[PDB]
Symmetry: D2
Subunit: 496 residues, 4 copies
């Protein structure tokens, strides 16, 4: 029952609508030889419309529903929504969405009477859907029910597992599409739930269009049988091999549709699901590396006017490593080598500093990531990062970090955050006010804080500096309610 009402003339509330004005400021720079940056500022006005009518229940279809994140994600909503307390060594525990930014982080609205900061919930500024108001379903090439999937995953406490048994046992993933030549082969001891078959059972790559049709049906059917209107699809399945974006097949929307029709080799399963999600209007989020959103799939989006992902879920490991890495260069410390070893954004940093990273001294940072397979750990992901930096006058700093957690209990909550923010971003439209009222960008570029390969538009360097990404996000919600950026100048203190 938390709310935020901001005394501002910049916000006008209409018919379950919200229009806010926003003077956006920035500037352009140009370094001359003489060693002087000329800075010319640039303002552009906007007006955002926020459809305050949020779904009483958001539909959620995960592609890879029976996986680790899939199963736990379902268990969480169930455990939380229904308040299932569970037993452990340390005693009974109460469900929650720890690790989830929207559900458990907080923001500063301003100061109180004494001059001290006041914090409010991330999701208490503007209305947002609650994961408990999620209705989940999805596909998976393996038919085990979400209870067996839980067991198999070994990520949840055995008590919190049994208490959910009954409810978890009723959930079953819809058969998925299985073009084997696109995943890490030998996922055949698993595939026993496919819609892509031929007259004689066997898995087939022929019929790529009917396969598409069948996903749209499952979407329609899901939306209908559950009586939902809003629904989001998240690919949280196997990582597929990329596909060649060659003209005549992957480029323009028409060719793509056609190529799916032609059963073309370059049409991956994630490709179908995507197109299928668009032709049905549901936002699609690709939480894996593969270049799903190829040119053609990106257009069929702009066209149908639906929203899309940013490629690859950013692990809580890549995040932390990005912060620290940023932390160092900020301080004026030149890391010179950074290694990662994990068994279950640097190049641009180098760009921000020409003091530390130049030719006379060297503008190179050694780095390497290593992911090894070790079954005997039980979901528990172990990652270790070694940073070697150069302090002044011959000095050196060595920070070795050893991170360890249940991996999924860290990934699941971030999946939720993407869903909640994707849905929220859906109800936002804008326009260059000016001294139509078009939606956002088909590419939801405010969800980068959760995506490792921030899908962007041409000639643009997506940024990473984690807290920057979270600040952009915070600063968005704020502008939406008539609040400016956080300046941290605390002048009612520094000043008399």
């Amino acid at each position: 029952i938390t709310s935020v009402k901001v005394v501002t003339d910049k916000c006008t509330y209409k018919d379950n609508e919200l229009l806010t004005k926003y003077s956006y400021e920035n500037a352009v720079v140009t370094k001359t030889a003489s060693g002087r940056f000329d800075v010319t500022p640039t303002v552009q006005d906007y007006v955002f419309k926020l459809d305050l009518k949020k779904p009483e229940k958001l539909g959620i279809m995960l592609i890879g529903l029976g996986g680790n994140n899939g199963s736990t994600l379902v268990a969480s909503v169930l455990a939380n929504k229904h308040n299932v307390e569970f037993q452990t060594k340390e005693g009974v525990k109460q469900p929650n969405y720890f690790g989830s930014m929207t559900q458990c982080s907080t923001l500063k609205l301003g100061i109180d009477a004494e001059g001290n900061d006041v914090y409010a919930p991330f999701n208490s500024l503007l209305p947002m859907v609650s994961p408990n108001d999620f209705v989940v379903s999805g596909w998976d090439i393996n038919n085990a029910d979400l209870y067996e999937a839980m067991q198999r995953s070994q990520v949840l406490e055995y008590d919190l597992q049994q208490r959910l048994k009954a409810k978890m046992s009723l959930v079953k993933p819809l058969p998925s599409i299985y073009y084997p030549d696109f995943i890490a082969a030998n996922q055949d001891e698993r595939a026993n739930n496919c819609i892509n078959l031929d007259e004689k059972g066997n898995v087939t790559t022929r019929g790529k269009w009917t396969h598409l049709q069948r996903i749209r049906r499952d979407i329609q059917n899901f939306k209908e049988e559950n009586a939902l209107d809003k629904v989001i699809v998240l690919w949280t399945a196997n990582t597929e091999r990329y596909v060649e974006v060659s003209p005549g097949v992957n480029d323009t929307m028409e060719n793509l549709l056609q190529s799916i029709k032609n059963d073309h080799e370059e049409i991956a399963p994630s490709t179908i699901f995507a197109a299928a999600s668009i032709l049905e209007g549901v936002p699609y989020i690709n939480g894996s590396p593969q270049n799903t959103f190829v040119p053609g799939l990106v257009q069929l989006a702009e066209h149908e006017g639906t929203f899309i992902a940013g490629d690859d879920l950013k692990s809580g490991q890549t995040k932390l490593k990005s912060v620290l890495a940023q932390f160092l260069v900020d301080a004026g410390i030149k890391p010179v080598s950074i290694a990662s070893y994990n068994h279950l954004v640097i190049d641009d940093i180098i760009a921000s500093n020409d003091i530390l990273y130049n030719d006379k001294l060297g503008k190179k940072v050694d780095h390497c990531i290593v992911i090894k397979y070790m079954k005997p750990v039980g979901d528990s992901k172990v990652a270790m990062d070694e940073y070697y930096s150069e302090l002044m006058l011959g000095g050196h700093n060595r920070i070795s970090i050893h991170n360890v957690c249940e991996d999924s209990l860290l990934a699941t909550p971030l999946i939720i955050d993407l869903l909640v923010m994707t849905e929220f971003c859906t109800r936002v439209s804008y326009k260059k006010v000016d001294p139509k009222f078009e939606n956002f960008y088909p590419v939801l570029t405010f969800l980068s804080y959760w995506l490792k390969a921030p899908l962007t538009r041409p000639g643009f360097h997506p940024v990473n500096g984690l807290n920057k990404q979270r600040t952009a996000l915070e600063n968005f919600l704020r502008l939406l309610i008539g609040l400016p950026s956080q300046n941290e100048l605390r002048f009612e203190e520094r000043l008399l």
Copy 2:
């Protein structure tokens, strides 16, 4: 030379000074029994003035000049000032200031000819004094010349020390003030450079007001002997013991000044220096944990219009904790335990009651351990263990191990404070009225320069207010302040010309 010319009608240049208009917005909030935050914005206009004429030489006087940092400080200046390369098992190295945020750090000025961020050196926005212009000197309870101090310290490359030897030798710290009972006895047979001595050259905590007058004279002599105009004083000496703040004694200006004239067992060596520093109009920075800025001393700083800095140099293991811990609470992760070993997060446990409350708990186990081991040397080895909670019973154990040479990290931070406070001393502002044109004369930063908390463990903030420690937040303020002065808004980090086509 790195320049940054910003085009705006908010900045005017008159008589070697910069005049920048600024509209400081903020907002006040109020909760409700029903749990509603009523946010009511706040705008207040200002007109800042930056004396552009930065001093040609910045006089600097350290207390603990012969210590690890004090000597390393002087070394680095000599090294960088005279580009003295040196030999390493790695080869000929060049002098630098890595670790110096004001020297080796960059701020973003915006985007370029295509939406690609453009950074400039932190020290390039507005004119700042460079460490290569510092005129270091100071005091120390030991007469060891700075060269000996280097050897004794064991921080710099033997070849480097060798190259600096000749010059470093001529630098000898002045006698300080030794009041035995304010520190340790292991550091007693080290005091052969004191000024509190009776006819029988023996330490005596009697005659304090005389010492107070002596230190003040030191400052004066230093100034004129180098032909300096500005001087900053920084206590980087040993850690004293807290002083019991009692009424009538050090609770108010005059009383402190008297408790001094009275040789009170509460007047510490630093207090004399602080008072001395203050009474001479030179800023004073407490780089040690002890609370030298007792109420009375602070009131003196106000009456005088001198600056002072929030206690204890924020090291590296600490800096990295208000980064690591922040990050975790910012992602909805609940750290439940934290242990620091080696040989403030309160404003976080409180910034989220979703995490910390009566139901789920609000206690976070922190515990530091600082054992000594002479072997390792100036190579402190810090180890931190973070045990946070994840949803549904899981946990996250982030154990960081980090070794390096403090003095090398601590010396540039000290260089930073100095550059930054000298900078602040040239900035004056003026509250402005939207209707009444020109409504005020300029003032100076409230004496307690909190713009320096980035480099300080226990931020010394004015009564009533709470000290914020978020490192990223502390830097931002430094940054927006500098932008603000050249006509740029705060960083919004939105990039709406990429997110919004």
Copy 3:
């Protein structure tokens, strides 16, 4: 069932007992002003006798029975004895004794049909009593039944505890002896199971000799109620404080016995148990750091012919330090500093004066840090930093971080001690004369069973001798002793049929 029949004329079997001949060689050495070691060999013949009839049930009584280890101890026995699988987020697990050197460890019997080492279970050489035959009981200053103890302890799988619940509940520790001043007050409101009470049921360190007689009776009752013959007592209770050994008091047998009858402020709870244990002829093992085996108590053990064990359970972080540190000095590497953090190597710094001497130095900085943090639970996190020296100025920094659940490591070690001491109680020897056939009657191990030092931090050795801590060395002795008893020589590890064709 694992057997190991060795063929040799050194072993004879008569009347449920094993008779093995053995020639114990050793050598005495002497240095010289010129630095010459004159090594003069030593041979002494023996005839060992091993009562093969091991007890059908081994009575075991713990002091701290409701503690983390005591309860885990009983759990594991119940679990393994009745093969009680349990559920984990990993699946149905089977009970075991991993961590138990006598149960899950193997000894090499030699080579096979081709020079390929053949190992057999440590407990297979000679008959040893299995933990599944222990009859656990004991005392505790708190009446919490063992099931509650489990919950309270938080060491075992919730499902496991649940399965053991019904049986674990019926196990309730006997009242112990509480002498407030010998430990901590935080552990005072926990004492609701005491036997030292006046008419006003209040703790009283008066009547000690009565308590002494009470404990002795406990032992007796335990025995007959279970139909046991052998019983071992192990103190795994809280850590008391050392007792000032003073003449006339606890310096000699009778005096101790009197200082007891006299209620002396030096007689501790453990002392009463030790004396009680001893006076009843049951071996006694001190699994805590305090020195309960004062001279007088030891002399009592001699007069009585009972066994006793060297103070403090050698944990995991420790075991791994007398392995890591050994290894380094054995390779000519000189460790100069060592730090142990968490929430004896003397006989190494001395085993090499090439490394440690007046020239190069002989001081190694060690320093432990044991801070408490309730969050992490029974999951102690140990961190060790080793900073050794390498030739020509280099160094080697080996920093190990290791987390696990003590009780899980400490419980099998306790099982080991018990199996091992019960074993020793059945072994008797006899010094033999090479010329005079049959020259002696059998004796028993000198009361202070040092064969158990493998599992003990502060080895309690007999006066004059020094306590050796090399872990590998401690195990070897255990091993060669067992081999020796089946007719095998010590391990030479030469493999001359591979090195010498």
Copy 4:
């Protein structure tokens, strides 16, 4: 001036000779189905002859002289031999061979009067050569003098470097043989010191026999010009690609000689050096992985009656990891996964225990080693090992170890130990006394503690358990002086 004189009738000293008798004991086992190991003991008598005449100066020729170990190894002997104290941050330091077992470890001879252990130097039992009595030379495809090689290597303090400049600058590696197709290609920016050339300069593979001849010459020349008789050669160069051991070429001694003559493709540079060392009688030690000692090269050895290596120098990293690994299984702890990440013996452990490692529970241990290249560390080798074990009743132990050192200052001293032990082993011969007097085994199998791939004879499992390897070694020196094995029974204590 330390010595050890043992009162024993087992040792008789003749003409600068030493003959000791040794009753060697062991036993044979055979596990029957019923679950019973039958143990039949087996004794074999021996008599070793130890030629007490040690070289007043041992010659040392390193193949790869200008490398890291090469240069430092030379610097150490020089620094120590000449007592060159050097300056550092912590002040003047005195040279020493720390890390060297023979030169700095110690052994127990027995107890003293009170019953307490007495220790003596590893090299104070029987006479052994001192590294200061080494005269070094060798080959290297790069001609830089050992001073430049020092600098390049960045392993030694800059003061201890300059003090050695003069002496180090006079040492230059003899040109080596350079068949590029055998090493990690592109070692051409280095090779500028080769004997294998043709009429027109360029490196060549043709003439493999003359190349051999030329090494023997350098050996003869070195031995002669320095007036030495004893000399050992140690390959401490690049790791070569293995070679196929095919009959008709690598098998019998004759074919090998012939194949070298035929310029056969399967004849590597290390192959030449080896054969060349043998045909000259000098022991050869291969401190690298490549299968140098192929069948043919092993015979030409037995034949010429010279001694050979054991393949690959055992790093102080593999050692420690082996101890700990052993430590665990000894305690009864079942490690289940062990990873290694290093950027600059398990299978048999699994065999020793069928309790912990069987089928019903699983007899597999996950493991992996990862060596990445990171130039910005300066010789400093960083290695990290993670062990995950299973304690009882659901428990788990996790020991993560982070090792760091100058790498070479750790490898060099072990090279010395091999040289000192190889030389010592040379002066040892034995015979199966019996109720000729042939030398050892061409394969010096007592130097395993220093070799990672203990070269052995057919159908034999070389052992590793580090301290076992060191004990065998200790137990050898002991038998040589009439002392038995260390039993640790301390009966003048346990017993009355």
